Amino acid sequence: VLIFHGKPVHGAIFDMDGTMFDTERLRFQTLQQASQELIGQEFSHEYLMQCLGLSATTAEKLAQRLYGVDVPYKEIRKRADEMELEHIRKHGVPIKKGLVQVLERLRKSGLRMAVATSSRRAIAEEYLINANVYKFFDVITCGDEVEQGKPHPEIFLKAASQLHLDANQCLMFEDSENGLTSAHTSKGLTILLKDIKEPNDEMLEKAHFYYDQMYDFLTDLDQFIPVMDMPEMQEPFPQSLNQLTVGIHGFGAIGGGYIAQILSHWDGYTKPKRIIASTRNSLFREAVNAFGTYSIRYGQFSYDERIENMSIVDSDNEQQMLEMYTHSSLIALCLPEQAIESESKIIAKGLYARFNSQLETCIEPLTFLIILAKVGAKYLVMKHLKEALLELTNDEDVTEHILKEHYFCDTVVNRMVSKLSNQNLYRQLRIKHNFLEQHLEDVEIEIEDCNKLTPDQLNQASIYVDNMRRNFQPGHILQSMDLILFHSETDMPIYVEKGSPLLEKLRQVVLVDQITDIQLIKNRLWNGVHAMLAWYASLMGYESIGVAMGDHLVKAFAENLIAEVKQGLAIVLPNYAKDLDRMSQSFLDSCEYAFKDPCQRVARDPLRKLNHNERVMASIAVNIRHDLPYKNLLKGAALGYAYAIQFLEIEETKAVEHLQQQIQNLDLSTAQRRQLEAELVQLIQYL
Amino acid sequence: VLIFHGKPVHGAIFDMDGTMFDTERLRFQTLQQASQELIGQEFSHEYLMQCLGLSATTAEKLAQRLYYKEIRKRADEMELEHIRKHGVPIKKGLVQVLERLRKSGLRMAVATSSRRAIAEEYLINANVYKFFDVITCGDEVEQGKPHPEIFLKAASQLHLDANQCLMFEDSENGLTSAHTSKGLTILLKDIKEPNDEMLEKAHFYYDQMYDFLTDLDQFIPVMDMPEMQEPFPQSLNQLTVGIHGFGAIGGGYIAQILSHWDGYTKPKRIIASTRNSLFREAVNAFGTYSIRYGQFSYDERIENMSIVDSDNEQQMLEMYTHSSLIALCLPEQAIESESKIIAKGLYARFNSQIEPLTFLIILAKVGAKYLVMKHLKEALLELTNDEDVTEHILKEHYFCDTVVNRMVSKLSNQNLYRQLRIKHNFLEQHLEDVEEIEDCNKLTPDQLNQASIYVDNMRRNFQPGHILQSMDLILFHSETDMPIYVEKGSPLLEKLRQVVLVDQITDIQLIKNRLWNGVHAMLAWYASLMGYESIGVAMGDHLVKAFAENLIAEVKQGLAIVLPNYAKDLDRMSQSFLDSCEYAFKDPCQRVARDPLRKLNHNERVMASIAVNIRHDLPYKNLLKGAALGYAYAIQFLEIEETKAVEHLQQQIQNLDLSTAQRRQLEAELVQLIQYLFS
Ligand SMILES: O=P(O)(O)OC[C@@H](O)[C@@H](O)[C@H](O)[C@H](O)CO
Ligand SMILES: [Cl-]
Numbered sequence A: 001v002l003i004f005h006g007k008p009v010h011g012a013i014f015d016m017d018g019t020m021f022d023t024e025r026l027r028f029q030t031l032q033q034a035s036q037e038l039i040g041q042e043f044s045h046e047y048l049m050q051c052l053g054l055s056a057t058t059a060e061k062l063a064q065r066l067y068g069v070d071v072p073y074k075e076i077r078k079r080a081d082e083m084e085l086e087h088i089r090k091h092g093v094p095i096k097k098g099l100v101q102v103l104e105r106l107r108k109s110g111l112r113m114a115v116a117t118s119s120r121r122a123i124a125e126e127y128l129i130n131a132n133v134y135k136f137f138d139v140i141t142c143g144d145e146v147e148q149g150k151p152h153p154e155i156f157l158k159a160a161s162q163l164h165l166d167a168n169q170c171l172m173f174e175d176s177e178n179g180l181t182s183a184h185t186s187k188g189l190t191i192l193l194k195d196i197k198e199p200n201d202e203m204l205e206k207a208h209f210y211y212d213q214m215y216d217f218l219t220d221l222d223q224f225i226p227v228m229d230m231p232e233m234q235e236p237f238p239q240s241l242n243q244l245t246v247g248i249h250g251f252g253a254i255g256g257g258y259i260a261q262i263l264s265h266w267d268g269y270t271k272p273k274r275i276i277a278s279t280r281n282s283l284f285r286e287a288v289n290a291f292g293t294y295s296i297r298y299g300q301f302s303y304d305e306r307i308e309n310m311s312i313v314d315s316d317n318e319q320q321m322l323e324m325y326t327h328s329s330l331i332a333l334c335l336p337e338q339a340i341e342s343e344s345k346i347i348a349k350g351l352y353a354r355f356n357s358q359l360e361t362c363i364e365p366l367t368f369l370i371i372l373a374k375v376g377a378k379y380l381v382m383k384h385l386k387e388a389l390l391e392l393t394n395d396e397d398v399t400e401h402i403l404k405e406h407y408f409c410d411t412v413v414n415r416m417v418s419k420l421s422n423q424n425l426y427r428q429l430r431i432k433h434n435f436l437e438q439h440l441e442d443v444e445i446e447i448e449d450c451n452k453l454t455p456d457q458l459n460q461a462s463i464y465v466d467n468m469r470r471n472f473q474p475g476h477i478l479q480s481m482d483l484i485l486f487h488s489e490t491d492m493p494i495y496v497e498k499g500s501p502l503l504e505k506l507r508q509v510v511l512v513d514q515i516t517d518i519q520l521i522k523n524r525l526w527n528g529v530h531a532m533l534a535w536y537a538s539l540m541g542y543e544s545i546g547v548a549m550g551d552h553l554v555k556a557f558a559e560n561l562i563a564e565v566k567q568g569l570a571i572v573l574p575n576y577a578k579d580l581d582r583m584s585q586s587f588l589d590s591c592e593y594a595f596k597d598p599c600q601r602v603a604r605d606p607l608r609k610l611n612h613n614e615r616v617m618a619s620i621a622v623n624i625r626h627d628l629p630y631k632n633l634l635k636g637a638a639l640g641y642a643y644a645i646q647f648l649e650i651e652e653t654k655a656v657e658h659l660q661q662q663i664q665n666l667d668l669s670t671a672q673r674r675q676l677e678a679e680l681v682q683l684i685q686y687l
Numbered sequence B: 001v002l003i004f005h006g007k008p009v010h011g012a013i014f015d016m017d018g019t020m021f022d023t024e025r026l027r028f029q030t031l032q033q034a035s036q037e038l039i040g041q042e043f044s045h046e047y048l049m050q051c052l053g054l055s056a057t058t059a060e061k062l063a064q065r066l067y068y069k070e071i072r073k074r075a076d077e078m079e080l081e082h083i084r085k086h087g088v089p090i091k092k093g094l095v096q097v098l099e100r101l102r103k104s105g106l107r108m109a110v111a112t113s114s115r116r117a118i119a120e121e122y123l124i125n126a127n128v129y130k131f132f133d134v135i136t137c138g139d140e141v142e143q144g145k146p147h148p149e150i151f152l153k154a155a156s157q158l159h160l161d162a163n164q165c166l167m168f169e170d171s172e173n174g175l176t177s178a179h180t181s182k183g184l185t186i187l188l189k190d191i192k193e194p195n196d197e198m199l200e201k202a203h204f205y206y207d208q209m210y211d212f213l214t215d216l217d218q219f220i221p222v223m224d225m226p227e228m229q230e231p232f233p234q235s236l237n238q239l240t241v242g243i244h245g246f247g248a249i250g251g252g253y254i255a256q257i258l259s260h261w262d263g264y265t266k267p268k269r270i271i272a273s274t275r276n277s278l279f280r281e282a283v284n285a286f287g288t289y290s291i292r293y294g295q296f297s298y299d300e301r302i303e304n305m306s307i308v309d310s311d312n313e314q315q316m317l318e319m320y321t322h323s324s325l326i327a328l329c330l331p332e333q334a335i336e337s338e339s340k341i342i343a344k345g346l347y348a349r350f351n352s353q354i355e356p357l358t359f360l361i362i363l364a365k366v367g368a369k370y371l372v373m374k375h376l377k378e379a380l381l382e383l384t385n386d387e388d389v390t391e392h393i394l395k396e397h398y399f400c401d402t403v404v405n406r407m408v409s410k411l412s413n414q415n416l417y418r419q420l421r422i423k424h425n426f427l428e429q430h431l432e433d434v435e436e437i438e439d440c441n442k443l444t445p446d447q448l449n450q451a452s453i454y455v456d457n458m459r460r461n462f463q464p465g466h467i468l469q470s471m472d473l474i475l476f477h478s479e480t481d482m483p484i485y486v487e488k489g490s491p492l493l494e495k496l497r498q499v500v501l502v503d504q505i506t507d508i509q510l511i512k513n514r515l516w517n518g519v520h521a522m523l524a525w526y527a528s529l530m531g532y533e534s535i536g537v538a539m540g541d542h543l544v545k546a547f548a549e550n551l552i553a554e555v556k557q558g559l560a561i562v563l564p565n566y567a568k569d570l571d572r573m574s575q576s577f578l579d580s581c582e583y584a585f586k587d588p589c590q591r592v593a594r595d596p597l598r599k600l601n602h603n604e605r606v607m608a609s610i611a612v613n614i615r616h617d618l619p620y621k622n623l624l625k626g627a628a629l630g631y632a633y634a635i636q637f638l639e640i641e642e643t644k645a646v647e648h649l650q651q652q653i654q655n656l657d658l659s660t661a662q663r664r665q666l667e668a669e670l671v672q673l674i675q676y677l678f679s
């Protein structure tokens, strides 16, 4: 059962106009536009504000007092009604921000939901069908189906009885005075929502709960509905779209092959209506926007995950990049380390455009995910962004404000991804284009029978279906046709710094108070073994680490090495015991068929990786202190100094000079220090 | 690890030409046509038969021994051009095999004598490249087939021993290559009839790929009942299925069952018949349609759908010739007329040369199959004019009784028009919004120019249909009830996830008729006459629910004596019915109340219960009120005339297994209670 402020809720009855849809502000605009056409002068904003709550006859008499007795009010009101339906039917019903997010939460809480509207059955059903929120409601109760409408409680009492519920078991959402009176009298849990006019003190007294907007109620409802569990592989994305946009600054391997999945999952209730991703690869941009979608291939399960509602933009296009930082609620920075200084200029322009912007997508702060595989990545991005903001604004107060306004989150990613080559894409586009030609071969409308339709709307149906058929038939092939751009592994969880309220409900995210702990695991358990295995694979004489796993000695070494590190980390970080076991297998699985992962890239800068407080020597010092086996780690350290001397042409004198300095820095006994070196130097000589 | 005839299998290496695809037969023709228009003398069959599963470099060596780069160039160009026009000729059962081996956790690869450029082209086109971890080609291998280097390299790259891997091949050369590698060799006949030497080398042999699939499937697990919002399989098999009657059950239930299939693969195409032209044209215009599950506000998109006209003869013959399973989802009134269309289809299947058809009879009636088999025999004998050919057809195919519990409604024509009108205005506005691949990024200007023309026309074709990502076509409001109960017989049904096979279908069909359909029809009449248009809303009323609980009590008490062995299950079956009714808000009363006279027949869901309770002296007060409301509904709502209602009432009571005393009493008590409701 849903508990809302200590009250068991089994139902939810919504008002339509003002509560769910922003149709009152559209009526304002149409009435002004209609007046400008007929009488020549616009009806004042102040007049229309005064008309809210009054009847059509009262509003007419007020218009007569101000604009003369012979004012064509009924003509203006009729034209305004035509302009309203016309705008709604083509551009869609204006939905209050947060509604669909609320409805999904209430529906997934098992609530039986209804609509109690003053409107007529016909227009009411079209509006709900238009907005694609009709699916959420079990019954609709209308003003033409009750003897006494608002402020009489009959409409809310009827809606409740049709759902097999007492009123006091139902949440009742309303904006108007007469509506709230109707909801309150019936004995329901009244939720008053401000539309245009600030509510009077009498209304605020009646209402059980009050909110300035829908999103404020959504924030409060989030306290009573759960954050969903980590998504499983091949689990569907949410059907319902929210009104938020998100950004992926760098549509690269990790950006398109991982972050796209996390943002596509979102909170499990809804997902963003659009995902904007920046790339300089013109072929990638034009291809994704042509299909309207792309897909990620998970080799292990031969599963093609389709990422919908994508819109690719040029990284060099200013207006497109500023639109990302202006419209998006969350942005994921998926750039290389070499691109930070150059891209920081475009970030500064984006945030400064957001600072100057007078839009309601910009008034709320931005959540910034730093997706870089380097320690102190945040420090690097924040430093460069500071330099760029001063260079653009030339104002220290505005610069600091922007840096402190937005949330900058440090992240740790484990999933490995491979971006498809431009040649492989062209090959795919040629074959997929050939299927479209084959599909456009067989494409080259009769609505008979009485059915229950008039001959006017039977002719009109033929026009609709034929027009739809001509436009959709070419895109029928997309039912079973995916544009593959990424080959990724099965690793789901992303570790993010706790801070941003927008991350609290993201189900594929793991929030940590400090990123230090999981970075140390990522360093020692993942990168450390990856480096020590890459050194072994290279000396054994293999190009990729994938081919190397075919050798029994290499795979055995990899399995024994992850065992010694995680045994030690289990004592140091026992609170991450589950994370160690999960990451252990995730690494071994990804390593198996890593043919596209070269050993050179992983084996770079061996001496730096063999430092006392780094991804090798630190793991040994822990295992020695806690009396655990370190034979495979000590072998790994030996392969490091061996690789450096053989492949990088480093001196044997430099290797020992470095080694000794690192051992003296370790927190070990003078006896333990000597024994480690004596054993290690002997292993290197053999190789 | 998979156990295939008591052998631990870790991997599965495949041959491409003649084993996966039927390309060996095609290149046979292209090499001959190429030789005609270059050297003049066409290649001998003895040369080409030795070139089967042989590397192009090794094939050039054999050409020198008898007498190629220029020949094979134009032959390969002809081959891939045939693939661009007619598609890749995929061997039947391949996709079904590949998925089962993948989901078993086997490390799969390819070992083909063909080039990498040619191999990838076909593997991508066929869309089977995703199933393989590594591929081995004739390019990288030094000593090609029949040397085991190619099959050893494939096994080594998978990180396994050859003896742990299965090996599929068509040719004699590739079998020797696979055998010398020391792997579990499998042989599939393509062109060359296997020699005695080959049958000794091979561990297992099969005539075609589908024969191996059948032998593999007895080791592959059978997946369990699907959950509500569980996805359908991605990969498509080469099988077709039919739905005779695109109605509430056909389109709103059966389509989901056939879309789930075995969980490994899904039918390539689903054919559905209807005389509703709007539905037919709408589904074909969109390409897909969605089932709406109101309880969880979930829209389930059904894809690979083709809606056909029931009266159109060639399209209905198309269904009964290509379909592996057909579901008959028609009302009782349309059985006699449509039986002639079924006869034509089954006789058209007999004349042609495929497999034994699985025929599902979906009808809410006691002895439903008897009625179908009766009308089918009469129809077939009328056309065939032979008892020997008909009795063969009637015993060839599997005719299966079913029990469907799921409550589903078909969207009205007015509501479907309303949907199209609203969603057409969005399309119009989108066409106003819609209103050059630069930078040589590791490509030639010529490729970049050719890519521009592909992307331009692709966008031009797809851009109008970008709205379909969010925009679905809703045609059915359905409850969440998953499992369909079917009679045992057909081997196909044993592997279908959403199907539950039962023995005594007749017993549960009787309870289903009396306890579900009977109470459902009678509370729908009561609710309709009280002014309710929704079953869900009607069950909110305390008198409507009390009536349903009073009926349930009277029916069960009768069934408890007729079927004492099911007496322990009635309380759970009755409660399961009320759970479905209570929150059926989108299921109209009209739909449940339709054809009152049919449902008030002597051997049907109302009168049968009344007759049972009179014999055993049980209360039938509410059942009698239920019957009265049925005739009251027929006269008041459907307008049949009272004269016909009383003649039906009198006729049906005469057909009941009762004494003349009980007939007169029942007739007098019922006609009195009918007049009472009209006063
Ligand atoms: O299909 P009918 O007209 O024979 O009966 C109406 C309902 O009882 C029937 O459609 C049920 O909904 C169905 O049998 C599922 O319980
Ligand atoms: Cl929203």
Ligand SMILES: [Mg+2]
Binding pocket: A015, A016, A017, A018, A019, A175, A176, A179
């Ligand atoms: Mg209102």
Ligand SMILES: [Mg+2]
Binding pocket: A218, A219, A222, A502, A505
């Ligand atoms: Mg929120």
Ligand SMILES: [Mg+2]
Binding pocket: B015, B016, B017, B018, B019, B052, B053, B054, B169, B170, B171, B174
């Ligand atoms: Mg072959």
